[PDB]
Design an enzyme around this catalytic site. Structure first.
Site, PDB file in Angstrom:
ATOM      1  N   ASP A 180       0.832  -1.199   0.000  1.00 58.57           N
ATOM      2  CA  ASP A 180       0.000   0.000   0.000  1.00 58.57           C
ATOM      3  C   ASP A 180       0.868   1.249   0.000  1.00 58.57           C
ATOM      4  O   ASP A 180       2.088   1.186  -0.096  1.00 58.57           O
ATOM      5  CB  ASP A 180      -0.963  -0.026   1.177  1.00 58.57           C
ATOM      6  CG  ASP A 180      -2.163  -0.929   0.922  1.00 58.57           C
ATOM      7  OD1 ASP A 180      -2.265  -1.499  -0.194  1.00 58.57           O
ATOM      8  OD2 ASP A 180      -3.010  -1.057   1.828  1.00 58.57           O
TER       9      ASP A 180
ATOM     10  N   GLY B 138      15.312  -3.785   5.419  1.00 60.32           N
ATOM     11  CA  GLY B 138      16.283  -4.534   4.653  1.00 60.32           C
ATOM     12  C   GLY B 138      17.346  -5.175   5.523  1.00 60.32           C
ATOM     13  O   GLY B 138      17.617  -4.748   6.643  1.00 60.32           O
TER      14      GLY B 138
ATOM     15  N   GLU C 198       6.375  -1.383  11.378  1.00 59.62           N
ATOM     16  CA  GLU C 198       7.725  -1.497  10.834  1.00 59.62           C
ATOM     17  C   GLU C 198       8.337  -2.771  11.400  1.00 59.62           C
ATOM     18  O   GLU C 198       8.498  -2.893  12.618  1.00 59.62           O
ATOM     19  CB  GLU C 198       8.569  -0.259  11.183  1.00 59.62           C
ATOM     20  CG  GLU C 198       9.956  -0.196  10.496  1.00 59.62           C
ATOM     21  CD  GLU C 198       9.935   0.394   9.081  1.00 59.62           C
ATOM     22  OE1 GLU C 198       8.905   0.970   8.671  1.00 59.62           O
ATOM     23  OE2 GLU C 198      10.965   0.288   8.375  1.00 59.62           O
TER      24      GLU C 198
END
Lengths: 273, 273, 273
Positions: free
Chosen positions: A143, A168, A191
């Site tokens: 999104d 990452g 997150e």
């Protein structure tokens, strides 16, 4: 045999990386790196893989990506009204209409994807970012202002809500990347970083900030853990009180766990209510 | 003398701004504003400066920026597939390959930077936003969907993680902008706004929302403060309990403080664990 | 009569949507859908409306938008340096300089707006996203990496701060969209979703994640509620303690309520202090 030869070139180059440079890179090596980038981009290579029920990592793939950052020159990227300047090619440049049709991906303007990321059919990218080395399986929704970070593995039918990020993991080499397994919901602004794994069928609510230092409190058992959301967990933001009660500190709370049968029957809103 | 003359033009114009307009602006003044914008963009002017160990603000620079917003006309920005419409030029438009090389900045597509922001060498801008008047020193990492707001001062080797924002401060004129000093880590999704200062070597974890109204609880001392993170502080999201214990309210918690020697030896993950 | 005829075509098509397809759509119907999209885009249709003091929803407008997603083909969007691939046109493509002037909107590069969203004069879009079906009234500020989701109703003089999201509501059909009434402040990183309504003159602080499952604690009254912020509420992030005190869970806390007279006199910072 062919991949074992390609891996060898990459590993030997990485070994003497500290004596390589952009002006001194074997033409055969820049080709090898580009062969690995192509395989990452079309999904024939992936940075991490579930083998015999265990997620495993292919360090030599990360080494190829790391070598691309060291050896590839930056170049102007001309957007007409402005310029950018970077060394990593974008995934969708010379892509034809047929190729877009064949891919089955919707790339909503102006979603940005680096080359070396694989994105499977029936995925929809709202304006978002997908970094090199990521693997996004079928039917995923990314999104608006979400991020799929480098080497991240996103399973089938995962929903990454608005403004949610999957961190990452290029270094350390031995670390598994951040992994979101099949049919997970990641709520807005959350997150998930640093190689945390969210297992199958989990529901993560809004504002869940989950890294390797984040305490996970299981309110059913009372256990505190790190780094893994077990399959079918419902996870919300919470706090844990100070030993003297003067304050509390942020944490994630597992408020329920749900089997696959239930997960298909009950809605996300009902699960959080 | 030359800068004192330029400042004078700006201040006299700002004084009678309420009787200026886009159709009525001295050609010599639109030139003066553009001279200040150029100096902000190449770093020879900066909105705030550390002088004799104290951060100070140059209000006349903010006045020039404010005057650009009042007097500059909006114009179409043609992106080919769509149009934008705004009055502030972008930083990287007529930039040559040599100039990009000389700058030492990587501008990852599609990071957006307004003209009037200075960005020093060895900085990497992932897709992100840098607003007019900001100053970004050497070696900074601005990660994906981060924001460096107007007039913000970002020190050397600062890491602004994904989705983290540094709030702009154009008004009030006398207010210091939001300041992140050298070697600070700003964790993902955090937001440092309204002229808060984060001093040297600090580590801010994820989901820290820190403005002038945000209580900062120092768990070592037990003090509650506002507006400043002292040097070497480790900061996490927390809560403070109600006087009757019915609820708690969000706050930032300083959980540790670390000297420069330790800061280089211990990792961020170990610091938060 | 003319709109009743247009609505009829849309509803009859939606009824037999499960037997429609991109290759089989009436040419007269693709025109009808485009007529509704045009009316949404210029504000003559809006998805939800306050009638006799009650917010009401026009389901047939959502049905037209849903039909555009089913029947419109994806096409390449050529950005020069890369390509996107999507089926929803952008709002500002063939827009002339005069039309931009007449609109009174500033579209800061590279803010992205889909066609079918209405945006009234004196609004400023920083780089942000506005989705199809949204209605943004006069004088709104949409800050950097904010999101105005599908069908969202944003009132006059609303400030959506950096990184804040207003969630879309296309389904369920009967649900009111997320509604932010006049003169609301939405603080940075907040997220208001799932048809929550924030009534007139409210101040929402940073990091408020508010959906239909989010407890709203009113600390003045002690009541817990869902789905609505009453007019003039000041809202901050908080926690609610466990029944055994082992932990607490995230919630929104209404810390004060303010009349219109006070709202114009006292600043946001003073309100939160």
């Amino acid at each position: 045999h062919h991949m074992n030869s390609l891996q060898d070139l990459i590993e030997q180059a990485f070994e003497n990386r500290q004596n390589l440079s952009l002006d001194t890179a074997s033409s055969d090596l820049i080709n090898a790196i580009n062969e690995v980038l192509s395989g990452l981009d079309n999904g024939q290579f992936r940075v991490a893989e579930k083998i015999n029920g265990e997620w495993t990592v292919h360090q030599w793939l990360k080494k190829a990506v790391l070598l691309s950052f060291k050896l590839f020159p930056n170049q102007i990227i001309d957007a007409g009204f402005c310029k950018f300047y970077d060394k990593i090619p974008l995934k969708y440049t010379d892509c034809s209409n047929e190729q877009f049709q064949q891919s089955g991906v919707r790339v909503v303007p102006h979603a940005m994807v680096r080359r070396g990321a694989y994105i499977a059919k029936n995925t929809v990218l709202m304006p978002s970012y997908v970094n090199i080395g990521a693997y996004i399986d079928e039917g995923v929704m990314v999104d608006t202002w979400a991020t799929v970070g480098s080497c991240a593995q996103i399973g089938k039918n995962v929903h990454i809500s608005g403004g949610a990020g999957i961190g990452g993991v290029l270094e350390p080499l031995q670390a598994n990347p951040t992994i979101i397994e099949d049919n997970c919901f990641i709520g807005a602004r959350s997150e998930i970083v640093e190689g945390v794994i969210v297992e199958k069928n989990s529901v993560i609510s809004m504002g869940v900030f989950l890294g390797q230092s984040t305490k996970i409190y299981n309110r059913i058992t009372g256990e505190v853990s790190y780094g893994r959301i077990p399959a079918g967990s419902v996870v919300v933001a919470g706090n844990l009180p100070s030993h003297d009660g003067s304050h509390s500190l942020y944490c994630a709370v597992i408020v329920k766990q749900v089997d696959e049968k239930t997960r298909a029957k009950v809605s996300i809103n009902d699960l959080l209510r």
